[PDB]
Amino acid sequence: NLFQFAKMINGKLGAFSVWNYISYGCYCGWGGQGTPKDATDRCCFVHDCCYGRVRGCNPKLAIYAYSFKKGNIVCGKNNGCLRDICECDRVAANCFHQNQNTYNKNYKFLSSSRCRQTSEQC
Amino acid sequence: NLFQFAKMINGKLGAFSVWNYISYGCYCGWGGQGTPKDATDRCCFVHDCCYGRVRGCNPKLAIYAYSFKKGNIVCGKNNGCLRDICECDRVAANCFHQNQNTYNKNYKFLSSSRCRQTSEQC
Amino acid sequence: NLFQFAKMINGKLGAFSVWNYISYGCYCGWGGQGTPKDATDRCCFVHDCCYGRVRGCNPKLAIYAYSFKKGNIVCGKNNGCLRDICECDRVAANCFHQNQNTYNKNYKFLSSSRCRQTSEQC
Amino acid sequence: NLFQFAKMINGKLGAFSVWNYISYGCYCGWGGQGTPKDATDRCCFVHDCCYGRVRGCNPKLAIYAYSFKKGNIVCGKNNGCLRDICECDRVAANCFHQNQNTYNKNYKFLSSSRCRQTSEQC
Amino acid sequence: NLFQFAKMINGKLGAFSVWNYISYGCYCGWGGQGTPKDATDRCCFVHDCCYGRVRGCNPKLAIYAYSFKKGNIVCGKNNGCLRDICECDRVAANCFHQNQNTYNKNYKFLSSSRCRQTSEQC
Amino acid sequence: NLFQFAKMINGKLGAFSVWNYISYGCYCGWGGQGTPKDATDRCCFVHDCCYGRVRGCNPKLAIYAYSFKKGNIVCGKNNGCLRDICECDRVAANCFHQNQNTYNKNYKFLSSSRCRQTSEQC
Ligand SMILES: COCCOCCOCCOc1ccc(C(C)(C)CC(C)(C)C)cc1
Ligand SMILES: COCCOCCOCCOc1ccc(C(C)(C)CC(C)(C)C)cc1
Ligand SMILES: COCCOCCOCCOc1ccc(C(C)(C)CC(C)(C)C)cc1
Ligand SMILES: COCCOCCOCCOc1ccc(C(C)(C)CC(C)(C)C)cc1
Ligand SMILES: COCCOCCOCCOc1ccc(C(C)(C)CC(C)(C)C)cc1
Ligand SMILES: COCCOCCOCCOc1ccc(C(C)(C)CC(C)(C)C)cc1
Ligand SMILES: [Ca+2]
Ligand SMILES: [Ca+2]
Ligand SMILES: [Ca+2]
Ligand SMILES: [Ca+2]
Ligand SMILES: [Ca+2]
Ligand SMILES: [Ca+2]
């Protein structure tokens, strides 16, 4: 569930951190095209693709099981797609945290003209 | 008027049904690209194209005349574009109802990466 | 800042005028592709590109200095990107006003199928 | 829950009818004081009272079982609070339908100055 | 209607000014009780009273005729309720302009605890 | 400001916790009258009172300095009103944490009929 994904992100970077990834670069947020603008943006490209490969369930609506163990995300008893979905978010959340140090505020709500490049394939 | 279109859909499938078609597949909702994912999604592709061919009026803002006769949509006294607009929505609404049995919840809020295919032309 | 841009537009065309440019043609609003549908729409294409060329700052979040002198927008003490950003909005706002006489309501919330053309380059 | 209440209303009066009751008279909607303006308003006063008597569950959030039978609302196999909640909703929706011909559009978004009278106890 | 009221305010005070009056003091905005905090607040109390006296039409929804003449608001050829509504709005907007220099930003989103005093009758 | 208040709450109780207090009991959220339903509600009554005593600044908008130290909230070097505001928020957030085990989900979106009792002075 997207709410859970936001939960992981905020649990990893702090309250409201999810908002730093709503419309960032060319792939973080609604839709996605062109080429990733940086590490953080690539995290979203990867996440988008991870979702694209899920079948049998809805990655943004399906509810899975997970938890935090000493500040680290932990996908619990999951089978099939649910397992895949949790894995998609867990990896994306850690990827944001891992690349926090290079987050470029100038990429927030990036201009449409800057993602006109060819859409890298999954 | 989009409110009227939502009226037809809800009148044909039930209260709030319109929300099942707000962001479904690759063409049901804001924007549209790639190739239709199913019958329901093709209904939206057709609807989008039907609008694209309307001239002289705004398909999403223009108000037309219509009504329900024994559970069936009926475009009334319409001339020119208004006639075309009502026809676009009427057909789309019946198309959703006609294909209700194959509606795939997994297509709601479909990942951007799954509509990367070539944009079928109208 | 986008709020400032809306300020210029409304200051030039009247209260709430900004809403006439939120989703107009193929480039006025969120995202932008295909070919401009008219003068007004080209104003937005130009504006989008003007933003795309800004570096070092966020064109939609950065706050610059400006004012109205006898009904005319005036970018004040600005240096670097801020200067560029204000210039982008000032030009766009005047461009809307300049082409008000050809504004086509039928272009508001234009169908996705009507911007399928090749995306003109900046 | 409130969504089910809305479906009851819409199922009895037509798509979007619930909106006719979001801010009507002195009681239809958030808060409520003063003299009811008509039968519809009286029923909103009662609906709130009915919710106020519920214990052990959240009337606006709890999900109960119900359905439509030949156009009439039927509360399903509910026990305890869920049964009371479904009833509150059923009675309120039937009342709106019952009094649809006296519904006065002039009471929509009523000024607070017309709801200052003393308030009756539930 | 309220949109026209907003244009009056913005036309007199500048773009987005209406927002300065959405939740100000004890009366500018939904509900209202207690002692007005200043002239601006007093005028909001009156505006609500003025709407409350209207009969035969919905003050917040009804559309009347008006225009600006040399910076001043002029209510057009309105009869019955529409004339009263336009007046309520005109007087309120002129009052906000009249008292713009005493407008106190500290009264924006005022705590409810400061609006408990007895309330004056319209 | 309110955003800082939300971060305090979320930092003490977890992501999105602030939402548990947007419309809870008779005082947690807009308006407030009647008898508090529990300790949490009592603290909301006080929080509003605390804001109501502030002068010279807008409690909901003013930005103060604060931080977290070993899980505890610390108000920074604030003078005048900013110090009082930070305190109002700190005390309220700590109270919600203190009483999280008595938090009753049945009081979320409480019916107005349960908040009619006389109201205590601040
Ligand atoms: C190409 O697109 C790929 C998506 O990019 C991945 C990055 O996503 C970060 C933002 O994701 C969310 C999370 C939650 C939400 C909702 C609306 C569910 C909740 C909210 C408003 C509390 C953040 C929306 C977007
Ligand atoms: C490529 O895009 C083609 C559009 O897809 C067609 C399917 O449309 C279904 C949803 O359409 C609506 C209908 C109404 C609305 C509004 C916002 C007017 C009303 C609302 C919120 C009550 C549903 C929005 C979208
Ligand atoms: C390709 O896209 C280019 C953008 O098109 C340029 C035209 O922009 C006109 C509309 O721009 C705005 C201005 C302000 C706003 C916000 C949300 C900041 C404020 C609001 C709601 C008050 C209008 C949104 C869009
Ligand atoms: C607080 O209510 C006091 C009593 O009034 C009873 C009349 O209620 C009218 C219907 O109320 C609502 C309000 C909101 C909604 C939500 C927000 C859940 C859904 C929506 C937007 C689809 C209408 C549903 C029903
Ligand atoms: C309920 O009012 C009590 C009396 O207060 C009078 C002061 O009113 C201030 C302006 O009020 C509004 C509120 C909302 C609006 C809407 C939502 C219609 C439009 C918007 C969002 C563009 C401001 C317009 C004017
Ligand atoms: C009016 O308050 C009366 C006293 O109640 C105190 C409890 O307050 C709970 C938290 O209140 C809010 C409300 C809104 C918000 C905003 C809208 C600023 C931010 C949001 C949406 C992220 C929660 C923050 C905190
Ligand atoms: Ca409906
Ligand atoms: Ca009754
Ligand atoms: Ca304006
Ligand atoms: Ca007065
Ligand atoms: Ca959070
Ligand atoms: Ca206390």
What does this structure look like?
The structure is a homohexamer of 122-residue chains. Chain A has one domain: Phospholipase A2 domain (Phospholipase A2, Up-down Bundle). Chain A has helices at 2-13, 39-52, 81-98, and strands spanning 66-69, 72-75. Chain A has 122 residues and is mainly alpha-helical. In chain A, a hairpin with a 2-residue loop joins strand 1 and strand 2. Chain A has a two-stranded antiparallel ribbon. The A-B interface holds A 30-33, 48-49, 51-52, 54-61, 119, 121-122 and B 31, 105-109, 111-114, 116. Chains A, B, C, D, E, F: This is Basic phospholipase A2 chain HDP-1P. Chains A, B, C, D, E, F: Its EC number is 3.1.1.4. Chains A, B, C, D, E, F: Heterodimer; non-covalently linked. The toxic basic protein has phospholipase A2 activity (chain HDP-1P) and the non-toxic acidic protein functions as its inhibitor (chain HPD-1I (AC A4VBF0)). Chains A, B, C, D, E, F: It is found in: Secreted. Chains A, B, C, D, E, F: Keywords: Blood coagulation cascade inhibiting toxin, Disulfide bond, Hemostasis impairing toxin, Hydrolase, Metal-binding, Neurotoxin, Platelet aggregation inhibiting toxin, Presynaptic neurotoxin, Secreted, Signal, Toxin.
